Design a protein around this ligand. Structure first.
Ligand code: HEC
Ligand code: HEC
Ligand SMILES: [Zn+2]
Ligand SMILES: [Zn+2]
Lengths: 136, 136
């Protein structure tokens, strides 16, 4: 009942991006440029279907350097991961929530079984606990 | 001798992103959040192989809104497209250069055969006229 490290996520579908600048209430820990990725299964849910078991969403967070009013991607800070398994992750609404420091498989960040993650994502129950919207 | 509209580019590999804010020398005309995409053939070149004919790179440019210490993606402004054809695009170093306003196939922007585009990309002769670097 741990979330698998999503190997190959950088080859997945790019859903959307956002910049969280210093002073944002979530600057700790998700300040930076983030990119959301979806595997094939997660795309089914984003397009308006039911999220199938095996759907994975990744929140890929980079530091940035402000250089002459360009924001330039620096080092990866972390990834957030939501892995769909209605039975195995039933305590957190059928998604398993994990973080990996610097996107490294060995650097697990979640210590409360994802209850804190779930606590915020629960607001989105109506879109199956996912904030990000598919855009063209 | 025309660049094809890169149908389905949103499903391709996300190379990198950058934000160009007001005050940056390039605010006009590439102000905004941009995402670079690569088809399979372009990935061969980006990894340090050679670019096969049919390699396509897309510069996907979004307007953004300031939302409480977040920069949020707004409307697409345009796409830039580089299409690899060593013979057909020999006058511009084997890449065809085109722009599509709002990413619409019907709003082609380039009027000089891509000489203006090539004029800047020529600085990157040593990396086959591509600025973007593959990152993790
Ligand atoms: C509110 C206080 C949140 C907490 C705590 C957590 N997340 Fe979340 N997350 C939140 C928002 C508003 C967003 C959308 C970002 C965007 O660009 O629109 C996210 C996004 C994710 C995603 C991407 C999928 C999605 O739902 O859009 C993942 C994979 C994700 N978050 C994981 C995650 C984990 C692992 C958390 C606990 C460690 C966690 N988030 C907490 C809001 C909030
Ligand atoms: C210098 C004054 C430029 C001119 C004129 C044009 N482009 Fe360019 N381009 C430039 C930079 C600095 C970058 C890198 C952005 C980054 O995030 O690193 C780019 C990138 C592209 C790409 C992506 C592939 C790559 O080379 O990185 C494409 C597809 C592209 N540009 C297309 C393009 C076209 C069609 C132009 C004329 C309309 C054009 N560029 C002009 C710098 C400059
Ligand atoms: Zn403030
Ligand atoms: Zn600035």
């Amino acid at each position: 009942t741990k979330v698998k490290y999503p190997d190959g996520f950088r080859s997945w579908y790019h859903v959307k991006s956002m910049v969280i600048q210093p002073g944002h209430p979530l600057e700790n820990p998700v300040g930076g440029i983030h990119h959301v990725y979806a595997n094939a299964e997660a795309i089914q849910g984003l397009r308006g279907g039911n999220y199938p078991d095996g759907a994975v969403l990744v929140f890929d967070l980079f530091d940035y350097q402000e250089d002459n009013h360009a924001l330039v991607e620096g080092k990866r800070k972390l990834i957030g991961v939501m892995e769909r398994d209605a039975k195995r992750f039933s305590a957190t609404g059928g998604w398993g929530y994990e973080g990996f420091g610097e996107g490294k498989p060995d650097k697990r960040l979640v210590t409360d079984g994802g209850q804190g993650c779930f606590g915020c994502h629960a607001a989105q129950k109506e879109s199956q606990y996912v904030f990000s919207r598919l855009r063209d």
